[PDB]
Amino acid sequence: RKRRRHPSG
Amino acid sequence: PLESQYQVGPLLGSGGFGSVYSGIRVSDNLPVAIKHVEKDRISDWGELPNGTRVPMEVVLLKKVSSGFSGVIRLLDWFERPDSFVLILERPEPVQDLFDFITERGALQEELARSFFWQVLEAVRHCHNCGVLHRDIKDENILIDLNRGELKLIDFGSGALLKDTVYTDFDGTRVYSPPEWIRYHRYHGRSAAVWSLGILLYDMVCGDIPFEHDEEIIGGQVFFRQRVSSECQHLIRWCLALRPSDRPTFEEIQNHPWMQDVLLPQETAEIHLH
Ligand SMILES: CN(Cc1cccc2cnccc12)C(=O)c1ccccc1[C@H]1CCNC1
């Protein structure tokens, strides 16, 4: 399962 | 002069927060992080006591950077024609909590308890200093791997803490609460507690629970890993749909799952070294 960062904004 | 006080090393990262370089203070070889933000890219502005116009982030870092804590310390800052430069502490050796969880997977509950406790103390410290972070997430947490201490970073989406409603938000959506998703309104403490529930799930399950707005407002927490009943209960309390049903910081830290926390040094020796 794809774990990813999430940019703010 | 910034060029003469700090020896500049490699780019550590860049994004909506600006560009951050590794660095070394020439005066005493103190490791620093050197953060550049373009003035045009700065949304919120504030004034220091002296009345100088600075980015809100500088204002917030000064309010929390007094003494020692689990918060990144602003050591200095400079204004340039088109940018501000921030000189920040740099733990060494360091890994951010996002990369740490990617590499290790779901954390043992003993380790998540120690980390979550330290994040709680760091956030209490911000709130005691009048500062609301508004972007609590694993990406914004550094681990000092030798000392076992967590450091909160990136106040570029924060605000002065207040008891009235916020109607603006520029933090991370997948950590924002359902009242923000549905109504574009939240109160500071209860929204922080929601983001802490997300963080705790992230720690004990290996990834955040929600990716989509519908999941955030749906009120259903499925546990994809083995998590104790006590820890599940704390997470579900932090993620109550109604803000007033969420625990205070005191209720979190008095929760049965939070008792008998490891010391930072114990944490490093057992889990990090
Ligand atoms: C650049 N950097 C590292 C970093 C940042 C701010 C202060 C620091 C102090 N000592 C060491 C490292 C420091 C990141 O941790 C990073 C990298 C890629 C993507 C995102 C991020 C963070 C920055 C804010 N939002 C997430």
Side-chain angles (χ1 to χ4, degrees), chain A residues 1 3-9, chain B residues 1 5-6 8-25 28-40 45-46 49 51 54-61 63-65 67 69-72 74-150 152-169 171-219 221-241 243-264 266-273:
Chain A
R1 186 175 305 104
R3 173 172 165 77
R4 69 190 192 85
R5 300 179 171 269
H6 305 84
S8 313
Chain B
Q5 268 207 263
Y6 298 96
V8 189
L11 185 71
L12 290 174
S14 85
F17 50 95
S19 304
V20 174
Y21 295 79
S22 189
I24 288 164
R25 186 162 63 185
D28 54 14
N29 295 343
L30 184 72
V32 292
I34 307 189
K35 176 166 152 165
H36 298 253
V37 191
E38 302 206 23
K39 287 182 181 174
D40 295 333
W45 292 81
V54 294
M56 185 54 49
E57 179 181 3
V58 166
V59 170
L60 303 180
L61 283 162
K63 283 167 81 57
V64 304
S65 287
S69 60
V71 176
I72 204 73
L74 182 65
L75 304 171
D76 202 8
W77 59 273
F78 306 80
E79 178 177 6
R80 276 171 171 184
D82 304 292
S83 61
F84 286 81
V85 188
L86 278 52
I87 313 293
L88 302 153
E89 281 186 312
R90 173 165 61 86
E92 173 63 11
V94 74
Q95 187 181 36
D96 77 49
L97 180 60
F98 179 91
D99 285 345
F100 190 87
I101 288 164
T102 301
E103 290 182 15
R104 290 229 192 161
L107 307 185
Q108 303 181 12
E109 281 189 33
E110 186 182 72
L111 177 56
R113 169 182 304 111
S114 166
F115 282 359
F116 194 64
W117 185 269
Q118 288 190 43
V119 171
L120 266 285
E121 293 283 320
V123 171
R124 285 178 59 193
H125 169 78
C126 295
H127 291 204
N128 292 148
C129 295
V131 174
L132 183 73
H133 188 279
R134 297 200 292 185
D135 200 14
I136 299 164
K137 58 174 177 171
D138 53 9
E139 301 185 68
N140 289 337
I141 293 167
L142 297 181
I143 307 158
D144 183 324
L145 297 167
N146 279 1
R147 295 182 55 81
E149 296 174 359
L150 266 50
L152 193 58
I153 63 173
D154 191 8
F155 290 75
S157 305
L160 304 175
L161 181 67
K162 66 190 189 180
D163 299 315
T164 52
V165 69
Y166 297 84
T167 56
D168 67 293
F169 176 76
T172 303
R173 187 171 185 91
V174 287
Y175 285 75
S176 70
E179 61 271 21
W180 164 254
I181 303 292
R182 294 161 68 104
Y183 312 117
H184 279 196
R185 301 165 58 86
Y186 58 98
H187 287 78
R189 302 168 175 85
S190 59
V193 162
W194 176 278
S195 77
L196 290 163
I198 303 288
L199 176 68
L200 179 47
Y201 184 100
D202 178 52
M203 292 190 304
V204 296
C205 287
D207 200 7
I208 56 175
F210 310 139
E211 291 288 341
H212 306 286
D213 292 356
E214 297 72 19
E215 296 164 342
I216 297 178
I217 66 174
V221 185
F222 168 87
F223 281 89
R224 68 194 67 189
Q225 289 244 16
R226 168 61 197 205
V227 175
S228 67
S229 293
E230 293 70 17
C231 180
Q232 285 199 17
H233 171 281
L234 181 56
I235 291 168
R236 288 191 164 105
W237 198 8
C238 287
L239 301 179
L241 285 182
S244 66
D245 290 343
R246 300 177 197 150
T248 62
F249 297 135
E250 175 177 19
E251 292 178 299
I252 293 172
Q253 287 192 298
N254 289 329
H255 191 275
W257 183 77
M258 292 256 64
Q259 302 319 295
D260 299 302
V261 68
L262 296 178
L263 303 183
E266 289 166 345
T267 304
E269 291 168 353
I270 295 166
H271 296 283
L272 306 178
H273 291 170

